[PDB]
Design a protein around this ligand. Sequence first.
Ligand SMILES: CC(=O)N[C@H]1[C@H](O[C@H]2[C@@H](O)[C@@H](CO)O[C@H](O[C@@H]3[C@H](O)[C@@H](O)[C@H](O[C@H]4[C@H](O)[C@@H](O)[C@H](O)O[C@@H]4CO)O[C@@H]3CO)[C@@H]2O)O[C@H](CO)[C@H](O)[C@@H]1O[C@@H]1O[C@H](CO)[C@H](O)[C@H](O)[C@H]1O
Length: 197
Amino acid sequence: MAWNNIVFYSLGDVNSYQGGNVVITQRPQFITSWRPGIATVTWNQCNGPEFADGSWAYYREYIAWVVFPKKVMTKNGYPLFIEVHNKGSWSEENTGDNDSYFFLKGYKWDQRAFDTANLCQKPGETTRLTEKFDDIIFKVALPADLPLGDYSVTIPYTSGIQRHFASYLGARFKIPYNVAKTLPRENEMLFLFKNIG
Ligand SMILES: CC(=O)N[C@H]1[C@H](O[C@H]2[C@@H](O)[C@@H](CO)O[C@H](O[C@@H]3[C@H](O)[C@@H](O)[C@H](O[C@H]4[C@H](O)[C@@H](O)[C@H](O)O[C@@H]4CO)O[C@@H]3CO)[C@@H]2O)O[C@H](CO)[C@H](O)[C@@H]1O[C@@H]1O[C@H](CO)[C@H](O)[C@H](O)[C@H]1O
């Protein structure tokens, strides 16, 4: 009988980027990087064995995610619009969403394994994620009506790896975008720039 275990491992990283001096018709950029690290299970869905002892085959489908806001409000109520500049090999999906960009990288599929493993780790459990993916470069559209000077903007967002283990070849599952939208946003980009007329 068939089973599928899917576990989302969330990375919490804090980074800053200097977007340098800009006038208000320029779109300063920032680069978000994927830093291998310790991730925490923030979601799962499982109906199969929780532990592979080594004696039997299972199949892996791994997909990295980034969920990133499309707009960032300042404390006074002004919006900063977040635009894609270069997303490398990330797949930009569910583009009609009001609020959030969804970037996916499905890098492993149909891959048979016998490796002993924990196939349904529970939320709050941690593991080390060694994988590395492309940077994403964002540009920011500043408002004409927005005011001047030095700015420091904290931007929370979600990144992590979906690991899907299945009993069969050809197994496919993608975390629904509505689920990905509401996952904990454990990363932070502190974006700095100096504004001018
Ligand atoms: C099946 C599916 O969900 N298709 C939709 C696609 O999902 C994939 C993307 O998110 C990518 C992002 O990198 O990850 C997953 O796919 C990976 C890997 O990236 C693919 O190369 C690989 O594809 C294999 C396939 O599995 C093998 O069967 C085949 O022989 O070779 C290919 C190429 O090597 O699949 C793995 C599986 O993990 C994930 O499944 O996302 C797309 C948007 O980016 C679409 O939503 C796509 O759905 C299709 O879109 C088309 C045309 O536009 C129609 O709407 C179809 O109706 C629909 O199924």
